[PDB]
Amino acid sequence: KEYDAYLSYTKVDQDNPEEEQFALEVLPDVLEKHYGYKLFIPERDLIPSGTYMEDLTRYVEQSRRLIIVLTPDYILRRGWSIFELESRLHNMLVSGEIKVILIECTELKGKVNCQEVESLKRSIKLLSLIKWKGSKSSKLNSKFWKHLVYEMPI
């Protein structure tokens, strides 16, 4: 366990700017610089290679938490699919070997998407739901941040 949490998010090229800004820079920056947590971010710390899947698996095993940022882009690309594609990660999620922190940034209005995400929720044993209200939640020392920090290790 070398990392406090594994950050899972999706970025799609050019639909709300505040959501993307919170998911890509504010969330990691506040978790690492202000609170001192150590996060593994694939798009920052891992270079894609032929061992990409095995590398991601190993990094998840070395992470004390799994943060999933539920943005519209994440739903579009089904950014959670990786954790279901690899058997080891799937077993870790369903058997409760790693705690998952699901950050709800949008409402699952879509029927099919809502059903799929519900099936994902039931597939996780240790699941913590935190709603991101918006600009109020991004403010430092807000209810959102206290909740998230409590769900974090140490």
Question: Can you walk through the features of this model?
Answer:
This protein has helices spanning 17-34, 42-45, 52-61, 72-77, 81-85, 87-95, 111-122, 135-138, 143-151; strands at 5-8, 39-40, 65-70, 99-104, 127-131. With 154 residues, the protein is α/β, with parallel strands linked by helices. It has one domain. β4, α7 (111-122) and β5 (127-131) form a beta-alpha-beta unit. The longest helix has 18 residues, at 17-34. It is classed as membrane protein. The entry lists the keywords Membrane protein, TIR domain, Interleukin-1 receptor, immune system.
Class by SSE composition: alpha/beta
The coarse overall form would be globular
Number of domains: 1
Topology as a string of helices (H) and strands (E): EHEHHEHHHEHEHH
Main pleated sheet? 5 strands, parallel
Portion in beta strands:
5-15%
What count of helical segments does DSSP give?
Answer: 9
Alpha-carbon Rg, integer? 15 Å
Strand order of the largest sheet: 2-1-3-4-5
Oligomeric state of the chains present here:
monomer
The beta-strand count equals 5
Alpha carbon gap, first and last residue: 13 Å
Q: Helix fraction?
A: 40-55%
Subcellular location: Membrane
Family: Belongs to the interleukin-1 receptor family.
Protein name: X-linked interleukin-1 receptor accessory protein-like 2
